[PDB]
Design a binder for this molecule. Structure first.
Ligand SMILES: CCCCCCCC/C=C/CCCCCCCC(=O)O[C@H](COC(=O)CCCCCCCCCCCCCCC)COP(=O)(O)OC[C@@H](O)CO
Ligand SMILES: CCCCCCCC/C=C/CCCCCCCC(=O)O[C@H](COC(=O)CCCCCCCCCCCCCCC)COP(=O)(O)OC[C@@H](O)CO
Ligand SMILES: CCCCCCCC/C=C/CCCCCCCC(=O)O[C@H](COC(=O)CCCCCCCCCCCCCCC)COP(=O)(O)OC[C@@H](O)CO
Ligand SMILES: CCCCCCCC/C=C/CCCCCCCC(=O)O[C@H](COC(=O)CCCCCCCCCCCCCCC)COP(=O)(O)OC[C@@H](O)CO
Ligand SMILES: CCCCCCCC/C=C/CCCCCCCC(=O)O[C@H](COC(=O)CCCCCCCCCCCCCCC)COP(=O)(O)OC[C@@H](O)CO
Ligand SMILES: CCCCCCCC/C=C/CCCCCCCC(=O)O[C@H](COC(=O)CCCCCCCCCCCCCCC)COP(=O)(O)OC[C@@H](O)CO
Ligand SMILES: CCCCCCCC/C=C/CCCCCCCC(=O)O[C@H](COC(=O)CCCCCCCCCCCCCCC)COP(=O)(O)OC[C@@H](O)CO
Ligand SMILES: CCCCCCCC/C=C/CCCCCCCC(=O)O[C@H](COC(=O)CCCCCCCCCCCCCCC)COP(=O)(O)OC[C@@H](O)CO
Ligand SMILES: CCCCCCCC/C=C/CCCCCCCC(=O)O[C@H](COC(=O)CCCCCCCCCCCCCCC)COP(=O)(O)OC[C@@H](O)CO
Ligand SMILES: CCCCCCCC/C=C/CCCCCCCC(=O)O[C@H](COC(=O)CCCCCCCCCCCCCCC)COP(=O)(O)OC[C@@H](O)CO
Ligand SMILES: CCCCCCCC/C=C/CCCCCCCC(=O)O[C@H](COC(=O)CCCCCCCCCCCCCCC)COP(=O)(O)OC[C@@H](O)CO
Ligand SMILES: CCCCCCCC/C=C/CCCCCCCC(=O)O[C@H](COC(=O)CCCCCCCCCCCCCCC)COP(=O)(O)OC[C@@H](O)CO
Lengths: 70, 70, 70, 70, 70, 70, 70, 70, 70, 70, 70, 70, 70, 70
């Protein structure tokens, strides 16, 4: 009697986040490198950025790799 | 019914930081060289400054190199 | 039938804080430098004071930069 | 309907600290020089004392230099 | 409603230290000369003792020379 | 036909509290400093005491600053 | 119709604490110095004891310095 | 209606500690000298033991020197 | 027409508790020290035990110190 | 009309714990020394074991030393 | 109405650990000597192994030496 | 006129739980050790498992030790 | 009147976990070694993996060793 | 009534990691050698890389060597 807005709403939210999450990732790299130059944080932040970027781009693939939502 | 201020807000914050982050980088180079002259810190700070400057200028390129936000 | 005291009350609170927040900032600089002389805290407090002062003076500009309240 | 004790309280606290902070600074110089004589700490404490004294005496000037509280 | 014990406490601590710090300085000179006789430490300790004694006796003068606490 | 005991009762309660609230504030400062000496609580209690004292003495002024009860 | 036991009760509690708080302060100094000898805690505890003792003896003066309870 | 066990309890605890703290101090001197013989720790432990012993024996005098508990 | 069992009942309950509360206090000291040995809880429990014992033995005196029940 | 099981129950619990708490203390010493050999924890655990053993054996004496339960 | 499994459980755990803790101690000696050959760690590990072995074999004796569990 | 099913029902419930509670205890040990390997929880879970196992096996004995149900 | 699914359900859950817990343990070893290569975590993770593996394989034996569920 | 995705999900995650963990290991060797050339880190990193590579390739074998998951 109505419209199913469950799948569409979830897809719309996913599309919206991808608009500005990538820009926020670039900000963190610039700010983190600045803090490292000032001797505020250790250098163990470099591997974190690469691993986090792997997870962000592989989010959809990882979920289906476990059999959920197929 | 409104305006999307997700991408614009992230871009505005990125533009603002680039106004004064470069000046802060020059301050660190001057202060770090002063501390080295006083025998307070080792000389291993020189490679750090070059590597940090590489990361700051390559932040946007590095993010898209991993496929995020394209 | 009455008076709108929403904008005025918020403005009055903002004006009151600016009277004594700046004096409190000077106290922290003096006390933090004293603790550093005593070998109680590391020197990574110096960049914090500059960054915090940037945020305090740019509070109004930063809010409107994101499109809120215009 | 009352009295504003925001600016006065902050000023009173600042005036009180300046009574005994300078005496504490002289104690640190005497004790630090003693520890250096005993071969307990390195000589990199001498530049710290001068820099800390610069910050303590310039606390008020530095805050207004950034535009806060004017 | 009470008594201010900020300046007095700092002065009392300064007076107490001067009672036994000078005796400790004489002990270091005697022990350091003994170690030098045994070929345990280099002779670069002699200039350190003179410079440390200059700093201990000039602690109060040096603090006010920078404008702090006047 | 009677007496209005609304404003008087509120004023009487306010006057009574001011008799012993200030003494209770001094107790907290003494006890809090004792706990800090014992390594039981962090040093972030010092700014709390100053801010709370500002609020207690400015209670009447703050209420009228928002236009209530004038 | 009764007796006001607000100011008296607060004063009585303050007087009681001053009987045994000073003895507890001496215990902490003795125990803290013992732990330092055993290489369990750093030497940054010495400035804490002096600052805490300043606060304990100045509790009443500090409260009235801000205008509360006068 | 009862007995005040605030001052007595604090005094009893102080008396108990002095029974075995001095013996523990002698153990540390013997063990620390052993570790030094084995080339495990530097010789900067010798000044620490003297300074700690000064603090332990002067705990009561130091507290009253600041005006607390008199 | 009957017997007043208000004061007697309260006194009887107080006497009963004092029979086994002290034994329970000794159990806590033994168990708390065991947990500390196992690195389960911090050492800030030691001051708590002394302060709690002061309160337990001074319960009757503290109540009458405030003027209640005299 | 019944039996008082307040003092007896507390005594029974105390006696039960002393059966196996001492064996648990020996386990901790053996395990802690093993972890130290593996370079997992610092050597500041040795003074903790001695102090904890002092507290466990002196639990009953310490409680009565403060006047509780006599 | 049941069985006391407090002393037995503690004894069983102690017996189990002694089965494989000694083998783990031999592994550490072999691995630590290997790291020393590679110039990765200093030679101050040799005294640690002897002292740790003394503590492991004397765990039960040390506990009863202090009067606990007898 | 009927049958007393009070003691029997309580005994039956106790017997049923002992069938699968022990298996659940083994699951927790396996899962807790897995979480520790992943750096999700601290190592203070090991003493908890031993103490909980002591309580489970001594439930009946502990109840009668206090005189209840005999 | 029904079927007892208490012991069977607990056994079924235990059997299911053992299917994939071992594979998860191998993943942690591979990932932990990778983080160590990157200088992100200390080397004290190696003893943890061995001890955790001992606990996982001995879960059933350890539970019955204490007398629970026999 | 469904599908068991416990073993398969764990296996899939293990297979995915092996795709890019080896490439990350080669990056660390290249970067670590660069830092060594610049006199930033000591040469004790060479044995770490070999030992970490041994652990990564032996993860599955080591787990079953202890009896887990067989
Ligand atoms: C994209 C690729 C980027 C690669 C990374 C950038 C590389 C830039 C060069 C530096 C490292 C060169 C290789 C290592 C040289 C060999 C190692 C060496 O000589 O050791 C020290 C450095 O000396 C040295 O060279 C010292 C001089 C090195 C610097 C050369 C001049 C550069 C400009 C100077 C202003 C800084 C500007 C920083 C931003 C660019 C000794 O010295 P000094 O006895 O003091 O004891 C310091 C301490 O030990 C005190 O405790
Ligand atoms: C898919 C697989 C991904 C794998 C993970 C990514 C790997 C990327 C490389 C980093 C780790 C390399 C292995 C470890 C190197 C050996 C360990 C080492 O050298 O240690 C520090 C790092 O130095 C170093 O190399 C420092 C340089 C390492 C980084 C190399 C250049 C990268 C670009 C730079 C901009 C960042 C962009 C981040 C996003 C990509 C010393 O340094 P620094 O004395 O400062 O004391 C810092 C601190 O100790 C201060 O408290
Ligand atoms: C908008 C952009 C803003 C950018 C952010 C502001 C930047 C302002 C400069 C600071 C960082 C400079 C770069 C880092 C310098 C290289 C790193 C360095 O030298 O390390 C320490 C700092 O030394 C140092 O320079 C110490 C001196 C640095 C400060 C220079 C003088 C400033 C005035 C002083 C009063 C404070 C006023 C704060 C408000 C302005 C060593 O020291 P110290 O052996 O003590 O061991 C401390 C600790 O390790 C003890 O545990
Ligand atoms: C606004 C700008 C401010 C700038 C900052 C202030 C500058 C004030 C001078 C100091 C640094 C000079 C540059 C560095 C000198 C070259 C480096 C040098 O010589 O090294 C050490 C210092 O020696 C030295 O000079 C030692 C002497 C330096 C101090 C000169 C006399 C000053 C008064 C003395 C009382 C202190 C009062 C502090 C408050 C003013 C050797 O020594 P020493 O073998 O002991 O091994 C110590 C350790 O290595 C033991 O582990
Ligand atoms: C209107 C505007 C009001 C503004 C608010 C009031 C401001 C008043 C100053 C305090 C904050 C200063 C800025 C922060 C200083 C930099 C931060 C710093 O040093 O950190 C700690 C504080 O040390 C410190 O300074 C400690 C000293 C700070 C206090 C200075 C003396 C004040 C009098 C003392 C009696 C109390 C009376 C309270 C009522 C007035 C270290 O310490 P401590 O190693 O112990 O580890 C404690 C913990 O971490 C243990 O777990
Ligand atoms: C109230 C005032 C109190 C003032 C404080 C007390 C002062 C008591 C004297 C000590 C410091 C003397 C001044 C410094 C001497 C000059 C500095 C010196 O010689 O350096 C080291 C100490 O040597 C030395 O003297 C070593 C000998 C110094 C001690 C003299 C005999 C004292 C009794 C011995 C039993 C301890 C009892 C401790 C409690 C009293 C070399 O040594 P060693 O090559 O080993 O490398 C150790 C390490 O570097 C290994 O890594
Ligand atoms: C109102 C104003 C008040 C101002 C605040 C009070 C000031 C009172 C002096 C202390 C700080 C002096 C300035 C800092 C000195 C320079 C810094 C310094 O030397 O560092 C440590 C302290 O050494 C030192 O001086 C140690 C000696 C400092 C103390 C001097 C004697 C005081 C009496 C002793 C009994 C305590 C009584 C406490 C209540 C009064 C080294 O040491 P140690 O190798 O052990 O490594 C400890 C750790 O690093 C181990 O992990
Ligand atoms: C009326 C007035 C009463 C005043 C209150 C009573 C005072 C009684 C003394 C305690 C506090 C002393 C001042 C603080 C000391 C300086 C602070 C200090 O050393 O810190 C810890 C305590 O160490 C320490 O001293 C530990 C030893 C302190 C206790 C001294 C022996 C007492 C008897 C022992 C049995 C208990 C009986 C309790 C009932 C009496 C370090 O330790 P540990 O590395 O373990 O890390 C623990 C944790 O951090 C682990 O997460
Ligand atoms: C109950 C009482 C127990 C007492 C404690 C046990 C005592 C057992 C002996 C050791 C300490 C002897 C006293 C100190 C010796 C004088 C100090 C000395 O020589 O210094 C180092 C040790 O050298 C040395 O002796 C090195 C040799 C010392 C060991 C002698 C052979 C022992 C067996 C070997 C297998 C280990 C088995 C461990 C378990 C038993 C130099 O060396 P190396 O240039 O390498 O720079 C290492 C580093 O500096 C690299 O950074
Ligand atoms: C009632 C009064 C009680 C008083 C309290 C008890 C006192 C019992 C002695 C210990 C402290 C002695 C004073 C401090 C010694 C000087 C300080 C010292 O040497 O430092 C460490 C301890 O070394 C050391 O002595 C290590 C040896 C100290 C222990 C001496 C043998 C005791 C038996 C051994 C089995 C344990 C049984 C515990 C229950 C009794 C170095 O070491 P290690 O390079 O490893 O770096 C560890 C870490 O830094 C690694 O991160
Ligand atoms: C009746 C009397 C019962 C008494 C109670 C039972 C006692 C059983 C032993 C444990 C405590 C030993 C005393 C404390 C040891 C000294 C303290 C110590 O070493 O600390 C941690 C534990 O390490 C350690 O020993 C870790 C090893 C301790 C366990 C020894 C092997 C036991 C079997 C293993 C499977 C579990 C089976 C559980 C059921 C029996 C460090 O570790 P790790 O760096 O990981 O940081 C963890 C965390 O800090 C991460 O955030
Ligand atoms: C399964 C069993 C595995 C066993 C573990 C692997 C073993 C692989 C060899 C290394 C250790 C050899 C034993 C120790 C040698 C004796 C000790 C020695 O010489 O000391 C340093 C290392 O020098 C040296 O050899 C330096 C050369 C050692 C390496 C030999 C060539 C290897 C390939 C190179 C690319 C890395 C690839 C890493 C992955 C395979 C001096 O140097 P350098 O003055 O620089 O001061 C560095 C620092 O002190 C600066 O602060």
């Amino acid at each position: 009697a109505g419209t199913d807005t469950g799948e569409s709403t979830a897809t719309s939210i996913q599309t919206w986040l991808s608009t500005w999450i990538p820009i926020g990732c670039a900000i963190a790299i610039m700010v983190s490198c600045f803090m490292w130059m000032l001797h505020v944080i250790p250098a163990s932040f470099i591997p974190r950025i690469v691993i986090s970027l792997i997870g962000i781009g592989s989010a959809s693939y990882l979920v289906s790799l476990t059999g959920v939502g197929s």
